[PDB]
């Protein structure tokens, strides 16, 4: 039921990490949104770090899901799964080995990202999660923001 946590958000998608934590790409969100999922935006705790957007709701929204671990990137060489969901409803899991993780700071504020190579993606896919299993837990490392033209390179934005 992991696929049920991937919901269309604005021009792309978003992922429920826990009953109250929703992650997406910053620039797929409508610029004039005054509410999300029935909750006024004033009551939602928003944290935008570059192209990584994080929404913490004041109550459990998805009371049916379990909590996963949100971590900034994956150790280099880790292969993860980009859970792409298309407009048709078709489910397309893509494998990608993760490479160099980069971070840029300005004024106390760190934006993050990590590159990967697919082992494709299209303009409607921003916001779909990158995930891999570690032990008896599932770890989500970011949401897709970019992909090289024609090649295998992809990029997940990190917190
Ligand atoms: C997703 C964002 C979106 O809504 O699309 C239309 C604006 C989109 C996904 C890639 C486009 C083609 N295939 C994809 O997987 N991302 C973008 O449009 C972002 C920019 C790019 O992806 C370019 N690629 C790169 O910059 C790049 C660099 C490297 C090393 O690899 N790729 C082009 C392929 C367009 C920009 C964007 C826009 C809006 C967002 F919300 C996030 C990101």
Automatic annotation (TrEMBL):
<comment type="function">
    <text>3C-like protease processes the polyprotein: 3CLpro-RdRp is first released by autocleavage, then all other proteins are cleaved. May cleave polyadenylate-binding protein thereby inhibiting cellular translation.</text>
</comment>
<feature type="domain" description="Peptidase C37">
    <location>
        <begin position="1"/>
        <end position="159"/>
    </location>
</feature>
<protein>
    <recommendedName>
        <fullName>Genome polyprotein</fullName>
    </recommendedName>
</protein>
<feature type="active site" description="For 3CLpro activity">
    <location>
        <position position="126"/>
    </location>
</feature>
<feature type="active site" description="For 3CLpro activity">
    <location>
        <position position="27"/>
    </location>
</feature>
<feature type="active site" description="For 3CLpro activity">
    <location>
        <position position="51"/>
    </location>
</feature>
């Amino acid at each position: 039921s992991i696929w049920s946590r991937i919901v269309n958000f604005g021009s792309g998608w978003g992922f429920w990490v826990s009953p109250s934590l929703f992650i997406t790409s910053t620039h797929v969100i409508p610029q004039g949104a005054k509410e999300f999922f029935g909750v006024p935006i004033k009551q939602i705790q928003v944290h935008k770090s570059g192209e990584f957007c994080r929404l913490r709701f004041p109550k459990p929204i998805r009371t049916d899901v379990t909590g996963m671990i949100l971590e900034e990137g994956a150790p280099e060489g880790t292969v993860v799964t980009l859970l792409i969901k298309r407009s048709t409803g078709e489910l397309m899991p893509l494998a990608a080995r993760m490479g160099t993780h980069a971070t840029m700071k300005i004024q106390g504020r760190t934006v993050g990202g990590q590159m990967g190579m697919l082992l494709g993606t299209t303009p409607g896919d921003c916001g779909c999660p990158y995930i891999y299993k570690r032990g008896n837990d599932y770890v989500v490392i970011g949401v897709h923001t970019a992909a090289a033209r024609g090649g295998n390179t992809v990029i997940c934005a990190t917190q």
